């Protein structure tokens, strides 16, 4: 699937251009199609909250916890693999975002310290065991739902929550349990 990887590289390029005080025009990223730029735009709009793809980027927040933008994706993949994800699967997910162990990510910083310490200290995640796995934290259970995280998890690599039968059923049951 070279075109998804192409959109990912274009997204990395647009992120580098956005963080630094550098402009972003179509001809600039042409040499470095419409499906690929639309994919880069969807990735920027969902993972980082960057709307427009000469272009002009407009953001959403990013009392600002920009790195916490990573949280709902993670809570998604954990919910995708039942309710607990292997650390290897988590790192595989972090890779397509461009975040690598011991690497200073452009926005997240070093990802291991952020996801096994910060998000754990904040009760958003749990990181337990010589193999480790990630699970939802109590803050996650309190501040979002299985249905909202399923909506997010489907919005990328999917379309609707109904495409996941068992997951949509579990989110319905979770909504019924919460209403009590």
């Amino acid at each position, epitope marked *: 699937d070279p075109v998804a990887w192409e959109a990912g590289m274009l997204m990395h390029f647009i992120l580098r251009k956005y963080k630094m005080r550098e402009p972003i025009m179509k001809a600039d990223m042409l040499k470095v199609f419409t499906e690929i730029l639309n994919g880069a735009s969807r990735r920027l709009e969902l993972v980082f*909250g960057l709307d427009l793809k000469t272009y002009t980027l407009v953001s*959403k*927040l990013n*009392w600002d*916890f920009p790195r*916490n*933008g*990573l*949280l*709902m994706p993670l*809570l998604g993949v954990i919910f995708l693999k039942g309710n607990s994800a292997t650390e290897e699967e988590i790192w595989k997910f972090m890779n397509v975002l461009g975040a690598y162990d011991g690497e200073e990510h452009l926005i997240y910083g070093e990802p291991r310290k952020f996801i096994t310490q910060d998000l754990v200290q*904040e*009760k*958003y995640l749990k990181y337990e065991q010589p193999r480790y796995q990630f699970l939802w*934290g*109590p*803050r*996650a*259970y*309190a*501040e*979002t*739902t299985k249905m*909202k*995280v399923l909506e*997010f998890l489907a919005k990328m690599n999917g379309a609707t929550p109904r495409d996941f039968p068992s997951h949509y059923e579990e989110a319905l049951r979770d*909504e019924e349990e*919460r*209403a*009590q």
Partner: nanobody, 120 residues
Framework: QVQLQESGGGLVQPGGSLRLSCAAS????????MSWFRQAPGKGLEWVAS?????????SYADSVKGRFTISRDNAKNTLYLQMNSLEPEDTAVYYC????????????RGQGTQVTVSS
């Protein structure tokens, strides 16, 4: 339009109790998960507690307060409550009330806060 108004702060002797309230207007209070944060003198913002929407049956607390603070909500009054028992001087801080955003890990609205001072 939207407003979160915290109230109930003041001086309190250690080991005593105090109820903080947060009145919410301009949005559907019952829809948002709510949180209490606090900022101590010369320290950063610290998450205190969180409670879910749609029944409020899921509470979460920091370890510093787990056995002593109690978050609750009245949807009919659009009000959030933080009951603080067995208070300690560490608990001296400005306390803020904040509505959790749909993108979990961020927040849409926050109040102006109320000062809680624990000293004998």
């Amino acid at each position: 339009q939207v407003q979160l108004q915290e109230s109930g702060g003041g001086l309190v002797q250690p080991g005593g109790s105090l109820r903080l309230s947060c009145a919410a207007s301009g949005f559907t209070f019952s829809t948002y998960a709510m949180s209490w944060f606090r900022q101590a003198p010369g320290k950063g913002l610290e998450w205190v507690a969180s409670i879910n929407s749609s029944g409020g049956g899921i509470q979460s607390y920091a370890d510093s307060v787990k056995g002593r603070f109690t978050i609750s909500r009245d949807n009919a009054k659009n009000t959030l409550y933080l009951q603080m028992n067995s208070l300690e001087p560490e608990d001296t801080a400005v306390y803020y009330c904040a509505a959790a955003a749909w993108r979990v890990g961020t927040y849409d609205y926050r109040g102006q806060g109320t000062q809680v001072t624990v000293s004998s």
